[PDB]
Amino acid sequence: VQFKLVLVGDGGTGKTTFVKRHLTGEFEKKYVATLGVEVHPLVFHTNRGPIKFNVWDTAGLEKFGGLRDGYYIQAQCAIIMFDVTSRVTYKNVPNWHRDLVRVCENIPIVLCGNKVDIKDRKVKAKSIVFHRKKNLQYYDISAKSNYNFEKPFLWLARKLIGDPNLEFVAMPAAAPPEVVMDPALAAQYEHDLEVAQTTALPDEDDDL
């Protein structure tokens, strides 16, 4: 099954970072503002078979907005993102919600407060009530720590498939192929390994 998912919310809230973490496993530290939209397929393996989200990761900065609500057409679900370290991003949640539901009247929507890994939280738990009258699911998330990072998709999967017991399952693990070292690429690998060994791994003070 495939579902169009639109991701909306203020610039720099972590939309692209979140999706990239889900696509590749990487944590992009750099802020490169999305230009209009980036669309990526994202598959989860479930106890009811694979689910594919067509992720429309939209630009939150007004100057890079592109088609704006044009991106929302035939969305089947949505994430509204804000940053719990930036109060303005929560203040703008009703504006994103407004623009989204005008185009997508009856879709499951998750509100995500991102960056809960940051000690100095500015949007406190008690302030976050917008979801209640709007029937949005809410999660505190961190694209950085992976806190609840699967919850938005699990909840939307359960809503779209109409099965509240749907679980993410371990994607099957085919036997990997036996390796033939290519003698011609020998000197090639020595180089590449050299560069990799002398580039520092990031975040050497993290738990892993």
Next chain:
Amino acid sequence: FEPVVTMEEDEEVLYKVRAKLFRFDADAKEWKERGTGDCKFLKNKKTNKVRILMRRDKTLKICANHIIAPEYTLKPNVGSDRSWVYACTADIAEGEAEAFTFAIRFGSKENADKFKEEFEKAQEINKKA
């Protein structure tokens, strides 16, 4: 009275350790995380072949799936006393066998030294098989 109506099952877990796996992107000349979770050495009970199988926390998506080839060498990273970098010629985490420069980092030097010990034990098993 009539009553009311992974592909890892063939494998022994030789070693299990929490780890963070990176792949080197030469284009950006930078390490990129591929996943965090249980790195497992799985001995196939049919072929006696040992692979690394690593799955991400929460999603359980595969971030490493490759034979611990006898020809691989664990090398230190300049930044870390608790990491190994090695060339992998054929990883199938993302389907099509690809070559990667991996780095895997552990909670501690102890964990990394133990990993190296087990990785070498696995290389020998794969050598005999």
Next chain:
Amino acid sequence: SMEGILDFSNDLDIALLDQVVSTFYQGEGVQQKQAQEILTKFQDNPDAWEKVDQILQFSTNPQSKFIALSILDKLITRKWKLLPNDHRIGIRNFVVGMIISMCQDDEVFKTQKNLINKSDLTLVQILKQEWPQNWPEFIPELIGSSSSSVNVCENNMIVLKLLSEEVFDFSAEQMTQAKALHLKNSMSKEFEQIFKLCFQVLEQGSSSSLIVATLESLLRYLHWIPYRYIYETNILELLSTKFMTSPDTRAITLKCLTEVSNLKIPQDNDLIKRQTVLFFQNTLQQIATSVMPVTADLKATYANANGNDQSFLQDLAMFLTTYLARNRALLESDESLRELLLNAHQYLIQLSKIEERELFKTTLDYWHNLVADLFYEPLKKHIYEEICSQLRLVIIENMVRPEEIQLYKSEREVLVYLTHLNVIDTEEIMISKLARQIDGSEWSWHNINTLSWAIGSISGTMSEDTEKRFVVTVIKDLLGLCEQKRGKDNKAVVARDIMYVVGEYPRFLKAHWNFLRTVILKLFEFMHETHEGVQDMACDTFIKIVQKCKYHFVIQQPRESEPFIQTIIRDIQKTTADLQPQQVHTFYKACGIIISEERSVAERNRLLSDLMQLPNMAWDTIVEQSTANPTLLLDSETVKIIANIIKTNVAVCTSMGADFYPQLGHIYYNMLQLYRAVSSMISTQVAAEGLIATKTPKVRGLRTIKKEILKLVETYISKARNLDDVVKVLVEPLLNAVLEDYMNNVPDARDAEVLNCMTTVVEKVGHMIPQGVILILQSVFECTLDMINKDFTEYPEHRVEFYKLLKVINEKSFAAFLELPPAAFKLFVDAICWAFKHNNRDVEVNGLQIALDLVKNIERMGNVPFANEFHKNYFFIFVSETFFVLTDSDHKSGFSKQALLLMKLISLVYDNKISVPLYQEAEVPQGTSNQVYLSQYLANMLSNAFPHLTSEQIASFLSALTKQCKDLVVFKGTLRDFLVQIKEVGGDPTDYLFA
């Protein structure tokens, strides 16, 4: 060929636009991306709007027509007032004509809701510009057109809903105050006629889709309309009976009734009270007969997630809690409303059992309101006894870990109130939940954990006697549970929970020294358990007990030979032998808490000396061997031991503050020597190995030593009582050790912690070290500015610490900026404006605060050359830099402090508090006031920056701004009005007279 639509020299190929649009929405990878960029460029072409008529008539692709309306919306909302009246009426008529056409075709009306809704929003954007001054008939015609057709009537409800939202719900950030008030008064003036249409539709009935659309518009009206439309018509009866019975209308009706419950209503009127009671009774009656009885298992229903059940039950929770929080006193006196009151609460009890975190928080907020009221209000708790007894079970079964601060806080406060209301009922529930752990029926780690959190949460609510009996019972039962359990996984979970419960009952520990002593010795035993989590919970419990019972460790307890702190210190090596370094630090920190309780100096200093024995002996050996042979510092293991010694000092300094001084004095000089020795090794290594050296385990270890030394000095100075000693003993060696080292390292080797340490030093003793503060600026100012002035991202820590340091220097030792050479003072002003342009809130706020503080600092100097030169050089720089960040849309989080700074700058001129001309000679008549010249400068600057504004808009804005420069809220209103007007053409200059 898709780029053909981007060629505006030729006509527009509609089939090509439909291809590009199809490729974007339905296409994939490469094709979708190309179409994307082409569509975005098409839409942003400023002449694209001219193509909308052609697209709307001739496209077969509803997505093309959607994007066409997006293009029209950009024109309508930004440049509309440039169009001739004829063209505005042309466009308005085309939009209305297209909406009616789509509504009159049943197939299109059914299948093109996206395009119709977007059309309706486009119409509402036109009403925002033309209605009602240029379209007085709009509402009579809409009302008239409603009777022609059910589809048109339904669509007119969507238009009126969007209009209400745009005028009342979203006007505040999007329109001037004047325009918002105008549209609000306009809608209010014609609402009588709109309400008559809505009421007639709700009465005359039939089409569910029409009824739902009408109720959606009503929900919006309820945000602003006077209560009489609800209370003095039949509409309350209709919403609370008819519309609750059908499921099509039930969802929206319940949301309407929630808002009805929020109306501003007369308080002294018995008819209105009866009506408020009646609609509630009617609503609950319909739910109990049409949806589910009071006994229904809503936890099961919600879990099953059939149809709209989850949203309905969320909405029912919102309705009940809203209504009851306002009106439950209406239901409490009359014994004929007792069943309704308790049934409504029983629905809430059932809703509270749903496994849905956010719905639970909604019900919990209500329960907090109720039980807080029952704790204080006379003659009320007895009404709710059975509701409260159920709620005790619900809260206990849902208790979360204290790590969930807000949710744990809410739950504990509700459970405390409930415990006060019936301590026997609470105790019975907790003991019988404990019995179900012990008999295995409810046993699990989660269940024993949640129960332990709940039991811990009510500490302090029982009488000391009742608590004593309760705690003993719980500890005996948990101990039995621990014995019972097999394997250390199970035993460790129960031991954790025992540790947890004991730590939450200090009143019990304080009364029972023998038990407290035993608990501590048991925690010490647990500090040898390698089983995961056991050592951490032993150390965590140790420090928690010490924080609460520290006095019992520092006195000689009857029948002890010594204060127990002596006994802990004597055995510390053995106690801490198996701990990880972080656990050791916690342990020593806890000992510091105890030792700070000893107010005899000789005894305190001796305990501190004794506690620090092992770090001091390790230190003394290393410093001797280390200075004898500076080589030994290259040993990885020695660097780790040194870091751990310094961190132990930090941990103990953290709990002892001012009392730590004698220990700081024991290590201080050799610690600063080590700082230099480690600094040389880092500099050496970076030279020998490259910038990569700073990523190596060895260099990171060396840098950890420098950071912990800085953290130790910062920690002590932040808490120091004796500031003479700080200045006379600590500061000069500190500045000699850290400042030149910071300056003379390459950027990548400079520790931002130096800046942070200096911030504390200036904060605490800056007033006493004017020459030290100058040295701090000379060492860190230019080289840090050069690190952070190439972009907004590099050296994020240095950026933040740099503006923290400038802020405190500007607050405490402004004289240091007076001593800067002119060129350096120019860099200081440049540094502040640079912070203004930062998006990082930390730097931006400090930058605006520095600017404000600097203006205040110059103001304080009065009529002297430096202050006059400052204003001549910098006044217009600060005014224009502030306007830049106010108006560029990239700095909205800084709005309040920008406004405050601009108001300060303008009030200086409008008070005549600037003694010289701000204009240089022969630029204006030589008599001219700074007021006239400021008006002129701002008019010129805004005209150049916003060429689309009229002279009249700028003049009216600046006239308002200068009049309002003693009234921040209003000044800010005028700034927000200007921020709306710069986004459009033809803004009304009279908007700035708003009052």
